[PDB]
């Protein structure tokens, strides 16, 4: 879906158009013999607020076989802290050793 | 004779005693130790540093080593390729000096 | 005397490199305790004899 | 009676996990685990290729 600069500018106030940013992190190093690239890539659209919130974990792959690749996330503790139930019903996390 | 003999008489005697003449493999033939501060693979110390070094020691053909190998194929595509520009005059080609 | 010669000669030139091949990894529970110490993880899939 | 509820078997929560995998990576050492544990940690890790 290619948004062109003309449209970003004239789109009706309603239309909520889909954009799509690159994942970038999982791209493998270019070769050591890849014909050098001459002209730079230009990018224009940026997101003014922090996108990717839906992101649970990301970059599940070894770096050089032990170091975590940069930008890799690993899931948050709270997303597997399955604790008891209250003295009622509401299910709450695990104490932190302080009740 | 029989030097090629590694072990021999693999079978119980009366169900516990080793039959006579039975051999059992030599320790050195499964002592797979490290590598030296170079490459030569040597036996395991005996708790007093440094070791035999298969080859630079006896003859016990050992059967287990630390072979280092390449993590994955080494000649996969992306063959180097240079662009070539030839001089454009073949008459103004220095050649001199040295 | 000569069987000995060409062979020293063969060893003389075994220009071959190695590539990890179809190794597998079993983890504890799958296999025995005894064998397990012996194994340090991801033993070559096409083992030998020893 | 009054059908004020539906008994379902294995419930389906609201949020889920959805993963996108670059499809060219794939550690080659193959990890095979106990046939039973391949059934607990079955989907989890599988989805998590």
């Amino acid at each position: 879906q290619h948004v062109d600069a003309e449209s970003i500018m004239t789109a009706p106030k309603g239309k909520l158009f889909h954009l799509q940013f690159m994942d970038g992190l999982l791209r493998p190093e270019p070769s050591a013999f890849d014909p050098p690239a001459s002209g730079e890539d230009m990018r224009l659209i940026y997101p003014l607020q922090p996108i990717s919130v839906a992101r649970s974990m990301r970059a599940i792959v070894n770096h050089n076989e032990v170091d975590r690749p940069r930008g890799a996330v690993a899931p948050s503790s709270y997303e597997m802290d399955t604790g008891t139930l209250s003295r009622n019903g509401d299910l709450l996390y695990s104490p932190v050793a302080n009740g | 004779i029989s030097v090629a003999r590694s072990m021999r008489a693999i079978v119980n005697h009366n169900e516990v005693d080793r039959p006579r003449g039975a051999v059992a493999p030599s320790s050195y033939e499964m002592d797979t130790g490290t590598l030296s501060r170079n490459g030569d693979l040597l036996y395991s110390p005996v708790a007093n540093g440094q070791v035999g070094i298969p080859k630079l020691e006896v003859d016990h053909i050992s059967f287990s080593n630390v072979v280092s190998m390449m993590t994955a194929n080494i000649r996969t595509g992306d063959d180097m390729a240079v662009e070539r520009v030839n001089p454009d005059d073949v008459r103004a080609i220095n050649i001199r000096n040295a | 005397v000569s069987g000995l010669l060409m062979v020293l000669f063969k060893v003389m030139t075994d220009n071959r490199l190695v590539i990890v091949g179809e190794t597998t990894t079993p983890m504890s529970n799958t296999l025995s305790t005894v064998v397990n110490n012996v194994l340090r993880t991801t033993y070559h899939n096409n083992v030998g004899v020893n | 009676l009054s059908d004020d509820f539906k008994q379902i078997s294995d419930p389906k929560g609201y949020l889920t996990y959805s993963v996108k995998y670059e499809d060219q990576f794939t550690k080659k050492d193959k990890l095979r685990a106990s046939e039973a544990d391949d059934r607990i940690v079955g989907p989890t890790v599988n989805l998590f290729k």
Binding site: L25, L26, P28, E29, A59, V61, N62, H63, N64, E65, P69 | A72, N73, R75, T76 | I19, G21, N46, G48, V49 | Q24, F25, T26, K27, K28
Partner: peptide, 26 residues
């Protein structure tokens, strides 16, 4: 039956590296 003799040598397979199309590290 009449107690047979038997020999077996230790197998040997050295396929020549199967070039793969998958990296496995970023």
């Amino acid at each position: 039956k009449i107690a047979t003799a038997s020999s077996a040598r230790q197998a040997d397979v050295e396929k020549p590296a199967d070039v793969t199309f998958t990296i496995e590290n970023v």
